[PDB]
């Protein structure tokens with residue numbers, strides 16, 4: 001029954017992927033950003049220069065006030081609002097209606113994006129990071145509790161942009177080859193363990209704890225591949241070395257300045273592939289996902305921003321990593337699956353890949369404590 005959900009995501013490049021939802025009775029239609037990096041369902045509920053529409057609680061007969069405030073801070077942006085519940089549906093999702101917690105956004109700072117076309121956020125991570133505390137049941141938890149929807153969803157993000165959120169299962173027509181699974185280390189963010197990193201086939205040869213300092217997560221609501229400082233410096237050094245044929249402004253490597261080439265002449269071959277090895281399902285076993293330069297040079301002649309950046313809160317496998325892969329958030333089995341997507345990245349001599357099995361010893365040592 002998943003065909004109805006294929007292509008149910010839209011977006012603008014670097015501005016997030018959103019799905020259409022309705023809230024309230026009679027249904028009010030809103031576009032909702034899909035965020036695996038948070039756990040609150042929230043919608044604009046008051047005028048804002050960047051909102052073309054918003055939730056009007058007064059017009060919904062099923063709205064209930066919870067008489068509690070809430071604020072959610074993100075890496076970029078924050079908002080505050082009023083908690084309540086209402087009936088919610090997903091037109092190009094399962095044919096169900098659930099009563100869900102909703103934060104009505106009344107004030108915000110650097111959260112809404114001019115021209116993004118979305119008005120709210122669907123936090124798909126676990127209750128442990130919900131605000132104000134873990135007693136506020138996240139939307140997907142409510143969906144699973146109140147309906148027969150199985151406890152998993154998958155995201156196919158395609159690189160103006162589109163994709164699919166398959167709610168309740170896996171659509172096998174959306175990927176090729178095999179799915180490779182990595183354990184969800186802890187149910188808060190979608191936390192995973194990276195056990196090895198290679199650039200153009202050369203191991204970065206860092207203590208693998210550095211890759212997960214202080215966590216590694218999969219976040220559809222972040223654009224970039226974000227790496228801890230020490231890992232970021234090693235990777236940039238290696239990427240600079242591979243592309244030293246051409247020289248780039250020092251601000252290019254920091255994400256500030258874009259770089260351009262005559263349309264159709266981008267020198268893809270001078271930028272390396274990056275392989276992230278993830279902890280596998282059996283003892284001493286890993287697999288790798290390989291990322292092409294067409295993913296981490298984000299298009300904005302042909303002009304691009306460097307979409308690998310530094311983090312002080314751990315690795316973030318953002319949208320440019322997820323794009324081109326079919327990603328299964330298998331909550332029921334506490335694992336995340338990766339496969340090559342039907343909308344994969346096309347290089348003439350290279351290809352994005354999900355490959356295994358690999359043997360990797362002492363993978364438990366790669367987790368940060």
Ligand SMILES: C[C@@H]1CCCCCCCOc2cc(cc(C(=O)N(C)C)c2)C(=O)N[C@H]([C@@H](O)CO)C1
Pocket residue numbers: 014015016033035036037038073074075076077111121219220221222223224226309
């Ligand atoms: C607020 C987000 C949803 C609206 C924005 C979606 C489009 C922009 C995605 O690009 C970024 C988003 C976030 C952080 C960065 C970043 O690396 N820097 C240095 C600011 C870039 C961010 O905070 N993402 C969060 C949530 O997923 C993590 O907390 C969700």
